[PDB]
Amino acid sequence: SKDRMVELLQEHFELNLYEARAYVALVAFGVLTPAELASVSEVPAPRTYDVLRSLEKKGFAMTQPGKTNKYRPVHPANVLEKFIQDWQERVKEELEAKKKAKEELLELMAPLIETEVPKYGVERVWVVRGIKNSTLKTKEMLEEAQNEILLADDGFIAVNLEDDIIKAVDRGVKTKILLTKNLLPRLKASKIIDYAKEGKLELRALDKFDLPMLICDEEVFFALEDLAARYFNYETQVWIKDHRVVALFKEKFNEYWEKAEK
Amino acid sequence: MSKDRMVELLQEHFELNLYEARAYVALVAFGVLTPAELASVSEVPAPRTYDVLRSLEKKGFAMTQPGKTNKYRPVHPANVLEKFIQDWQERVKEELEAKKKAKEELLELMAPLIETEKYGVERVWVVRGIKNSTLKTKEMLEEAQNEILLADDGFIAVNLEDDIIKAVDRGVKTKILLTKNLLPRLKASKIIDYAKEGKLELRALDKFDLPMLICDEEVFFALEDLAARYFNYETQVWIKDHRVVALFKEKFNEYWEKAE
Amino acid sequence: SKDRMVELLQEHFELNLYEARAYVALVAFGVLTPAELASVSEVPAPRTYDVLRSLEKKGFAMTQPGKTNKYRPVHPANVLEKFIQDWQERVKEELEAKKKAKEELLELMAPLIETEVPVERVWVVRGIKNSTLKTKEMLEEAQNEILLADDGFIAVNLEDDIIKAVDRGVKTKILLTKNLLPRLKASKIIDYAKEGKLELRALDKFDLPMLICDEEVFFALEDLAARYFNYETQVWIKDHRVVALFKEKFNEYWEKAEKV
Amino acid sequence: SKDRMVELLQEHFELNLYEARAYVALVAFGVLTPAELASVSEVPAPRTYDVLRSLEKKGFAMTQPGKTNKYRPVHPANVLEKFIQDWQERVKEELEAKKKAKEELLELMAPLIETEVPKYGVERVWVVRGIKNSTLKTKEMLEEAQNEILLADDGFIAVNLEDDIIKAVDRGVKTKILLTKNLLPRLKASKIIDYAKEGKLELRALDKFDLPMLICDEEVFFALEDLAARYFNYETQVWIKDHRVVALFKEKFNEYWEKAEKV
DNA sequence: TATATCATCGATAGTGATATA
DNA sequence: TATATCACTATCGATGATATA
């Protein structure tokens, strides 16, 4: 059962193999010198000196310093109990430290904490050119619109999104639709005209506007004008997610909005 | 030191490594992240983001977002951080109980070995560390038969009130000299009950250079070296010799004439 | 041995745990044997020898005349000061190697660089600290107009590029926040401002800082999280309609700005 | 060469192999996609994506975010210079941090600084037995005595150390020698008695004192009385280095001293 | 014998390669 | 073609064994 004594020492009292063996030897034989320890234990001769000295610091042994160091064991009923008590104080301090750390981390993370869940990533700028990619990107904006939808279309949009707008409107999203006159001839409803008549959305027409745009909440979608590209529907478009930037486009839209209607 | 301070604290007290700590701040910062997005916005290497995010969920700091494409959300700091300390307090409670079990079992195993602890023919021993003072002074108290002279600076016999009271019950004459700063510790103590009841003498003094414990013909004292104390390696001596004890006893009686 | 001393040593003086402890021990006790070091410290006995040998190689300890392997500490005032000196020295050495490398790189990349003309009309730059990596190209390419509303990051340290553009007869309007004014003391921009070579106004604040050069515009987005990680997004757009839009906003700010 | 450019990038601009290769490719070809980068560089296909994004953050590239990310290089004349400048600020901050750390370490170590050289160790307690070890230990005390030497000998000190005492005295060490009367018969004529007569040291004799001791400065050397052992000269002796403890023994010596007879 | 040193393990952490629809 | 993951290196620090004179 000496192995058991040694086993319980390493596991619950911060003693390593040799230190555990050394202490067990002391209790059993009483007073030992490093050399004597080597002959009655499994502690290597060369190590018994620092192992006994080690126990000395841990409170497991008392010593007679001299040419020949004598070591006697502390009564296990004392050292073992003293340890647990000491251990409990160390644990209390570590607990106080973890709690302090938590309070600090919480104050630091307060400003950084984000309650909005990123819908399709953290990117706030996206460059689109394809007809497919332009369509998907626009559908995302409308699908995620919550407050307002401002659409100034001259025809740069590759797809008719009557259903996506109407789906957005039925969700309670305020919608303003601005069209060029020579799009109405192809804009026979096909709803929207219906929703307009029913006052479910606003619909105004204008002959000319140079900066067509799609605004959804705090996002804007616009093209970098390229007349040739627009024909091939490969015109470069930009999506931006920023209230400052969108607020600017929103001012431009309202300038258009107050100038025409049919 | 804002973000980095957060990564600092996380690594120091919540067992996250550097990459895990960074990953968690990012999650909290951006709400949701792909392993790719994480590598992009953070100093966690791309090839490591995958395992790093998997390690965070296993540690309870991150949850795998519904569906696919490997999207991870952070567990709210108030939740994970509070939960971590709880579970840690839980594991500590478990260990504290295992220690108390081990002690009992060890004492059960060491009973046979200790025929005598009659503690030897040696008349001098050294003990390292003031925290280890009572590991010897307790044996002095239990063996005392006639006299006890204790001038405590707060370390000689800390938490040995019961052994002192017991010795008194055995008819050992006891004189206790304390520094006035130790008085409050004696409020609910049973020692005052014995002092005013005249079972032992108890006096106080602002300070005295040489704290000591005398029991019969034994004496215990500490040396004084600043460096040694910084390392918890102060030297304390126990001597069993009538001439030397008589010498220390004279010093005690000098102090005792100035107390209370 | 305050844990904080060992802490600082590891953080700022490139000692490992055992070495940091060893050095405190030396200073504490003045002279130590490898054996004595292991005894009084938490440095393993089997490691004290190399650890002390490593301390001398790092200049923190000197080998006592001996010869029985006794080690003394180099006084903190000496070793600590010398470490910083040598570190300042190595940094000076590296700074020169960097400037050499730069020159050599520019010489090697010369042949490659004939592919520079800013087809694409939009680019993104990460980090407000990287703004000028693009805004510098804008300024040098400016031919007709320059409209700069700076909050302190748009065109930091680009005074010379601005002055140069003006010299080429490019009309310049600079709108600054009043907190940046002191930075212009004796600056050459004021010399041109007072000489009527450029307009310079100040404003308490403005939401959308920007740089307009000809038909190009440069601006930053605004996300707190992104800034914590040095990953703020900045956009460069080359489009007359969009520039016209931003120029309208600029002219709104410009109508409210102090003449400076 | 391409190797030289990549080599200077890794060494002085905090770029790793792939990042360095990637940047050099950008400068050479202008605008690249991750897939394009793989076909004109040594950057592994699977890595080109995170490698290009990495440069993006370091200020070595500009990007068009989209399904297919396009990357353009920053002009090396700009990023390289910007780097050196940024790096100089980081070193500046680090210097302030090292210096601050130094001020604190100095304040913390001030009380701990030790000017006294041990000579024979840090031990302040030593247990000695035997003539050899008892003799050597006493010779050391006398060798290191600087201020005072107090000797109360009844014969427990074993070997006669007249020469070690006289050597100490000639060094300017104040010496008080207290002896038992029945040890005087063995001291004439040599040598201590000569120094006593010449008033180079004090010499007093006393019939009885129960606690013999050797005091050197802040060290005391005494035996744990064992008459049987003392005959076999194997009596247990203790050496202690402490001003408080030595001060106590010194009071006892002085008690004996005021009771002894001169010469 | 009592001085003086080595060997093995696991975990970081930086860095260049490899694998799956 | 993009995603997903691995593999090697050196250092640390913890722990159990070996080497001189």
Swiss-Prot record, chain C:
GO molecular function ontology, one term from the record: DNA binding
Pfam families: Regulator_TrmB, TrmB
Record key words, sorted: DNA-binding, Transcription, Transcription regulation
DNA-binding region of this protein: 32-53
Domain notes: Lacks the C-terminal sugar-binding domain.
Protein function: Binds to the maltodextrin transport gene cluster (mdxE operon) promoter and to some other TGM (Thermococcales-Glycolytic-Motif) sequences, but not exclusively.
NCBIfam families: tran_reg_TrmBL2
Family recorded in the similarity comment: Belongs to the transcriptional regulator TrmB family.
Name of the molecule in the record: Putative HTH-type transcriptional regulator TrmBL2
Protein source organism: Pyrococcus furiosus (strain ATCC 43587 / DSM 3638 / JCM 8422 / Vc1)
